[PDB]
Design a protein around this ligand. Structure first.
Ligand code: NAP
Ligand code: NAP
Ligand code: NAP
Ligand code: NAP
Lengths: 261, 255, 257, 258
């Protein structure tokens, strides 16, 4: 007689949406690209290397996903705009942007090399502006879009030797609020996704350091490293209609680290 | 099967103060995601009849009667429910009240009433349920916060104190209970048309101010809170702990 | 040519410090008196408060006392109104009285929950409301609410205390929202870790101290005199455009993982 | 008593460098710090402006010198700081004040304006803090005060890139604390609300903005620049020796309220 229905849960589906993930040739970006595709999105692989991005997109199509690619260095403003505009003209609309590309360089701030400072600013901060601006012109024209900026625990709490990275991630957290202030009126939700400590290549030296890992497990209420699949749920949520009234916020996925001494 | 990340099959959610308002909306949303739900009201006939209407709509639904402000009464009702109906795996601490006046004019009875419902009540129900969640080694606790967990508005300083308290109490639940497989998080709504906010909805000047103050340019609609609640109740948020997620159309991110 | 520095002087101002019979409150009372304030010692014990005020006077300070339990709303209001009329205006309020009770939240006794709420949260409301009525009417006043690291970051076994201190941090913003228009600056002062009787169990535990020193960028416990500068600043004209804020004095603890 | 209490805040025997102190908040803070007893160093990109101001402070009875550099030029800053330390002496207090503002909706924002903001407001803080901190760390004491903004916390339309720079500076401040508190450095932020300087000329001249601001601010008014001196002296003095990694907002209540 009765029929159980699922309206509030169905709003998590991404069917009919296209997501571009910057730096999705490997790492968290590739993990999130697959998670968003599984949730129904067409995806766009981004890498600086054309052959790599095109081949990865083809492997997604072999698995039945809708996938394409867009080649650019996020730090190159004009190059990014040309690639985004060409993709919109030839392929179609980008409805979700995940600003994932990023790098890490560790040293005490008094010894930090200026070239390392500059490289971090170009990728982690200039890059987020370059791709968001280029995509947002098209989202504004359509009156809807999602922008998800990958942040960090260092958007809130500092650690020794990574002061420049923390500067870039505090910048992205505020740039996210600024995207909301300028674009919420056009139906765009711009939010931050801040992972805690995840076992990945960016952090391999930390994972392999027994002293650091012992400290991290005591420091984190959850008592462990995160694993990258644990970010997919948050990314899907922020990309979906289920979060249409979430805007300007940064969601920390860190096992409780930022909530505790 | 990507939606499976967010499904609540086999879990039961209790929503305090779910006879009307946001609590009723969240109960429906969690049930649609697959949870069995528990209606809470201080009036047994109202709670039980609402649960019956959920069951008529194909949802698994029961009820539990208590005033969240009464510590021993809550514990007795939660323990009785756990023994007679079954495990509560998700707790939404939603019951709350509002009383507005400049702080220099605030009546101590109103101060006390806000503290009892919005702050004691979160402790009373969370402690009673968490004893059982700890024994099972898993649970979700979602505490309903507010914009006033972060930004103050004139005439609601005592409410803001309760919602700042609940935001920190949420971090404290994580600190004590993450080791037992419990994730405790806050969900802070912006502005929604419920009876809590009747005076604001009916004030054209306030509504005009709110639409300019909110980047999204409008009031929220209560169903826009279900996604965040389902996320924080599901395995999709198992590595989210001690956080408060604001669902406010951008209000707290902007001047 | 010292204008900007004379903005820290408190001459001509009177400061009430709740719970100033011992601990941080007594330290802050002395610090404010040294900066020129007349001070009011508060304790629940009439003889203790009277003795402390007399000894401050013996050292050349202007001091009086006002006896009340911060948790008792009517008793606080009566004592504040009586003092305002008999002795004179209170221009600075330091809401310092507070308690701590530690236990895992699932075992927390409701009597201990209630005690923490009554002192740490009701108490701040009770004294702030009573004093602010007078300050608002005069058009000037400073309210300084003593917060904690637990206004922002939790620690196991002190979730109820954290609730009270998160409440006080937001109540501070609400005081600003209602009262800044009347010339009141209401701000929070959040100490990090200090060796008072509040924290005796922590001071006495070398493993806790080892954790704290490694957790704190400054690498040490604070010393209670290191709180006086912040209190004088927030009590003085030097902070007339600071409002609704909570200043953490914690050696960097809350800024770091 | 009074000597003991004011002693907390006195800056006698200390030297403060204020970047971009040719005008605006930086010049006001330079005067406030000198009034509290500090020897001061005026910084401007133009030698004749910095030299003239430093002489004017000396004519008024203050100890004052000048150091010319563009905060955005890493190697130039390093050479200028090291030369000042070698020839004149220790810099004990650094106020990273130099900054600019460029306003446009983000989708129309010019890359040249984005880059200008990053170079001054973010690179510049790194460039001068690194150069000075090397000396402070070696001595085992120092104060760094980074000028932030309401936009270190709350966004406003048309200034998203500036907000990015000020969120960056707020976190960089925490990073300075994490790396250098162990060496006796206190690094903190001072975030002004709204003040009538040339930075904000377009806002002062916009009656609708001013109307909005006075309603938005619990204090109900613009700040006056002298209201920032107290916070700067506090963060430069012994009174703040256990304050580290924090950003103090001086904004009349703005960031605390809806
Ligand atoms: N625990 C964590 O790992 C963690 C925690 C918090 C935040 N995050 C953030 O998560 C994001 C992804 O990090 P990850 O851990 O996946 O690091 P990763 O394994 O090192 O991957 C970084 C990705 O960014 C790409 N990339 C770098 N510079 C680029 C540029 N100029 N243009 C285009 N793509 C570029 C890389 O491509 P190439 O192969 O060409 O190098 C790679 O695909 C970053 O923003 C990082 O800050 C990570
Ligand atoms: N825009 C918004 O509405 C908004 C924004 C931010 C936060 N919130 C929060 O959302 C929650 C729900 O509020 P609402 O807007 O839905 O308000 P509402 O329509 O007034 O509903 C409040 C609910 O709580 C119940 N309740 C009150 N005191 C209770 C007690 N002692 N024991 C048990 N139940 C009790 C009420 O039951 P009765 O029918 O018996 O009165 C009612 O079901 C509250 O925590 C509120 O602070 C709301
Ligand atoms: N590291 C720290 O010590 C630390 C850190 C952060 C925040 N704090 C805060 O700093 C404040 C002072 O704490 P403390 O460290 O100085 O603690 P303490 O040594 O235990 O002193 C607490 C003071 O409050 C008084 N008090 C307690 N309940 C009272 C009541 N009902 N009415 C009036 N006075 C009452 C006590 O008087 P009796 O002698 O009658 O008990 C005593 O003078 C508290 O708000 C505390 O939360 C302390
Ligand atoms: N309400 C406010 O005014 C307000 C609010 C919040 C934060 N702030 C911050 O306060 C600081 C001072 O701003 P303000 O209001 O005083 O602005 P202002 O009147 O425009 O002054 C800015 C100062 O920085 C200097 N400067 C700019 N770029 C420089 C560079 N590359 N190298 C060296 N000096 C440089 C300027 O020198 P020139 O004379 O050569 O241009 C000028 O002396 C900035 O960091 C600003 O973001 C201001």
């Amino acid at each position: 007689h009765h029929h159980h229905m699922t309206h509030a849960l169905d709003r998590f589906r991404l069917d009919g949406r296209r997501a571009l993930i910057t730096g999705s040739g490997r790492g968290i970006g590739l993990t999130l690209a697959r998670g968003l595709a599984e949730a129904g999105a067409a995806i766009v692989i981004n890498d600086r290397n054309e052959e790599k991005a095109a081949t990865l997109a083809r492997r997604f199509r072999d698995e039945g996903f809708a996938a394409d690619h867009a080649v650019f260095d996020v730090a190159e403003h004009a190059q990014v705009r040309a690639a985004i505009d060409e993709f919109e003209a030839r392929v179609g609309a980008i409805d979700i942007l995940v600003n994932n590309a990023g790098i890490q360089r560790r040293a005490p701030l008094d010894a930090f090399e200026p070239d390392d400072w500059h490289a971090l600013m170009r990728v982690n901060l200039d890059g987020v502006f370059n791709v968001a601006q280029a995509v947002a012109r098209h989202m504004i024209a359509r009156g809807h879009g999602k922008i998800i900026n990958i942040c960090s625990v260092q958007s809130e709490l500092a650690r020794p030797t990574i002061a420049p990275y923390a500067a870039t991630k505090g910048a992205v957290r505020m740039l996210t609020k600024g995207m909301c202030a300028d674009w919420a009126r056009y139906g765009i939700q711009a939010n931050g996704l801040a992972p805690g400590y995840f076992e990945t290549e960016l952090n391999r030296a930390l994972v392999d350091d027994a002293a650091f890992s012992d400290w991290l497990c005591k420091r984190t209420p959850a008592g462990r490293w995160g694993q990258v699949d644990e970010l997919c749920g948050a990314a899907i949520f922020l990309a979906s209609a289920a979060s249409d009234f979430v805007n300007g916020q940064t969601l920390f996925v860190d096992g409780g680290l930022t909530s505790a001494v």
